[PDB]
C-alpha cells in the first residue's frame, strides 16, 4: 500500500495506511546537554541584569 499512487480505486482504510510507516522506529528524544545549556543562559542573563 503506497502513499503515492494506485492504478485502481482500491480504497484503503486509514488505519492500514497509518500502519505503513517507520515513524515508531525513529525515536524522538532530546540530548541532556540542552538542560545545562539553557539554564546557563538563564543564569548569566539574570546575573547581568542584576
Amino acid at each position: 500500500i503506497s502513499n503515492w499512487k494506485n492504478p485502481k480505486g482500491y480504497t484503503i482504510p486509514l488505519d492500514k495506511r497509518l500502519a505503513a510507516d517507520g515513524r515508531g522506529l525513529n525515536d524522538v528524544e532530546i540530548n541532556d546537554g540542552f538542560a545545562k545549556f539553557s539554564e546557563a543562559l538563564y543564569t548569566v542573563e539574570r546575573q547581568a541584569r542584576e
Binding site: 500500500i1 485502481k8 480505486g9 482500491y10 480504497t11 484503503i12 482504510p13 492500514k16 500502519a19
Partner: protein, 120 residues
C-alpha cells in the same frame, strides 16, 4: 471391547485428519479415493482360477516377461464407473470451492489487507 476398539480406530484416524505440501496432498487425495473404492467383483476370482489351471508355461501373474498386459481392453461397466467417479469428484470440487470498499475488487483487496495487516 470390539466396539471400543472401533472407537479407538475412529479417534486415532480423527487426530491425523486434523494444506502442508503438494507431496503429502497427492497421497491424501489418493488414499481418500481408495477409501471410496469398491473392488473384488466376480471378474478377478474367475480370472485367477480359470487360465491358471492350464498354465503349461509362464504364470498368469508373472510380469517379468509377460506380453499380454499391453492389450488389456476393459469392459463397459468399468469405464462407466470411471466416468461417474470423475464427474462426482469434479462436482464435489465445484461444491467445496464456493462498507470500506467501492467495488468488488476493492472489497477483495481490503479483505486481503485485513488478512495480512490486522495482526500488526
Amino acid at each position: 471391547i470390539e466396539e471400543s476398539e472401533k472407537w479407538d480406530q475412529r479417534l486415532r484416524k480423527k487426530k491425523q485428519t486434523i494444506f502442508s505440501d503438494y507431496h503429502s496432498q497427492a497421497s491424501k487425495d489418493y488414499n481418500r479415493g481408495i477409501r471410496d473404492l469398491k473392488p473384488d467383483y466376480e471378474k478377478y476370482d474367475k480370472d485367477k482360477k480359470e487360465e491358471k489351471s492350464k498354465s503349461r508355461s509362464v504364470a498368469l501373474y508373472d510380469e517379468a516377461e509377460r506380453l499380454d498386459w499391453v492389450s488389456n481392453k476393459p469392459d463397459k461397466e468399468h469405464v462407466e464407473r470411471l466416468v461417474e467417479s470423475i464427474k462426482k469428484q469434479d462436482q464435489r470440487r465445484l461444491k467445496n470451492t464456493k462498507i470500506t470498499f467501492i467495488n468488488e475488487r476493492n472489497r477483495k483487496f481490503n479483505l486481503k489487507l485485513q488478512r495480512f495487516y490486522s495482526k500488526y
